[PDB]
Design a protein around this ligand. Sequence first.
Ligand code: NA
Length: 450
Amino acid sequence: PATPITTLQADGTHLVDGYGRTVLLHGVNNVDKDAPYLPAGETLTPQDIDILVRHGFNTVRLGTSFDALMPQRGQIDEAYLDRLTGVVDALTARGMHVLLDNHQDGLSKAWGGNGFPEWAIESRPREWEPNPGFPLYYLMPSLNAGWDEVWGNTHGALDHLGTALGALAERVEGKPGVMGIELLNEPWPGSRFLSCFPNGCPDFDRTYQAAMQKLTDAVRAQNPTIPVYWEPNVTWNQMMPSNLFAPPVTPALTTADVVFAPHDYCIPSQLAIYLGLPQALRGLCVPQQDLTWSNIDAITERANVPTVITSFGDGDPTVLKNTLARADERFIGWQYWHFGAGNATDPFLGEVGRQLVRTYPQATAGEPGRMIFDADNGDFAYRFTPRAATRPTEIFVSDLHYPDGYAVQVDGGQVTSAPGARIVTVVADGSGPVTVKINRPGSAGAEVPD
Ligand code: NA
């Protein structure tokens, strides 16, 4: 008898469910970048969804796009919206919190990318201008001129995008499992991007923040309560800090339920995948990714809003621990790139899945304390401080790490679930801290960090 899914509400840095519990989201991306969008029989199947549930994932970052929503000037595609809501409903029915990702790469299909419809952008690449494809096409002069049209609202591109996202927001209004709308994937600053280096671009971030606020206000005009997810400008991915929410340079947030949505990629990993550069350069992933996490801490400290890592990984098993361990340190959730529809085999049964599939507290009837998971042998420890909630703490137990079953110990509380349950339920004895250990029966287990 599964716990009915609820809306999530940001309370400082916490996402809190309808039962008063603090939620940790671990899941995947599923994004359709080419017309026709979400066509019959090419979306996530019940077998796909069974795979996600089996491995205890509780979120999907589901792609949409301006092009999908408004493929002709001023004309919402209501049929596309039917198809999208069908996928959303399928996911939320199985306990997945769905984040609607307004996706783009390279601005538009004019450049071989996706996201903004071609009718909305005037700029076009010339026949003689080199196009290196993703990701280096962000250096093309015509693609930069396109971005300038966006941030200058030269031809009303953001006004139309506001209409599109407003229509989406209206369509999903009232659905508790919709965790929000992510306003724009990887926003690129355009022609003056060199102002972001080597230490960020406060003036651009003022422009960007105002655009995100305008979009947020348009969304909220049609759906007053839906959470909105704001990415940093994408020079973030080249180690640059964000200047969002940094008065007096940029405004303090005065809008409820805004969540920070950064990505966490290793540059040399991505360069090896897309350019064929030496894989051994990934020697630098650890220190470079540590820089990203430090940039996240700065936002957390200054703005006091939640963070979800909305994209990371991209098939490289060597880099995952850098995200996973640092996210666990901060009790921050995440969505892995990428999970395709129509899987003929479970793609989580190898090295990537060994790390992504974890024992973890999906919802805590308390304030989270420190947590560790050992992805080699399944050792798990977690401490938290109880607060009153209307449901118990629920901890998903990896279906991969315990081939002879699992043992659970709780200090300061009790296990109320059956032996071998997929979900461990824990009720606190009192006001004092609760410590949960889960491990293989013969293991001495993990210790709570610090
Ligand atoms: Na498609």
